[PDB]
Amino acid sequence: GMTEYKLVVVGAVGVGKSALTIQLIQNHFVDEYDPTIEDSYRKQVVIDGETCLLDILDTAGQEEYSAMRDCYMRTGEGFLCVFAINNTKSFEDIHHYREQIKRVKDSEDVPMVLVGNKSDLPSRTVDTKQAQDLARSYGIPFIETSAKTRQGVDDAFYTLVREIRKHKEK
Template sequence: MAEYRLVVVGGGGVGKSALTIQFILNHFVQEYDPTIEDSYRKQVVIDDETCLLDVLDTAGQEEYSAMRDQYMRTGQGFALVYSITSRESFEELRAFRNQILRVKDRDQVPMVLVGNKVDLEGSRAVSQEEARELAISFGCAWMETSAKSRVRVEDSFFALVRAVRQDEEASAKPSQRRRKGKAKCAIM
């Protein structure tokens, strides 16, 4: 069974834990309790393939930034979460992405941009258009969710797994092509 290590990142108070717990346990956490780091596992079927998801819910607060390099190094896919009610959380995403790319030493890493708290539409501070444009510039999918109302929560994690699968397939192909082109020799 395939196993995927997914990391949920974003600023403090954007709903990373609420999204993760809603996905894993089908439960909405009302109170805000800043996370240091929590890990959850869940077996799911995505596109007719059973897989095990290891989801790491991370600290958004700046005082825990020293821990980020470690979990970014081990993560395969990243959910970049912001609150649609917080412009600051949206503007922080570029720094999170840049840190991930630096730690992974790659130009592209599987990611999904997740705008959480769509149940608070009346307090929206980030337009769908600018979020869509940022996702295009990052080369990743984007969707809006509500951990409270369970809107597109599962979709966001499944989209991230699909991005990881595409990345794995793309990185496997060049090595297969190289092998086909190599000359073979026989020692007699």
């Protein structure tokens, strides 16, 4: 029937993957979501005038040597690669997540969006220009979000769905 999209949210612990996912699904901010809970959520949404169903996997935790994890990446069609703008390491680890995805899916072009989360925080350590430069280099959209205020949350997920559309159209 209507088009389904398998989305996977990856990124360092603490960056806001669960908060972003819950804002999208449940439209509220949860500020203490169990950091170890990994789960999938479905929601029917309208993007660009068309209804579609998002199946979203909020990852956690053991990253390497995990059959379950590798399976999510094989199956996933698009990936939100999240870092927190006050957490430089989480930004400088993005490449690790990207490498793992390209490895498991064995493809040079996989739909991804770079998400700089925690935009509401006054102290950043990652400049917008830096994130922009990395995303441009990767050939992927970059979007700043705040799960706390909800700014950019729909935009992050809709943009990824749009990247999946193109991939299919090419």
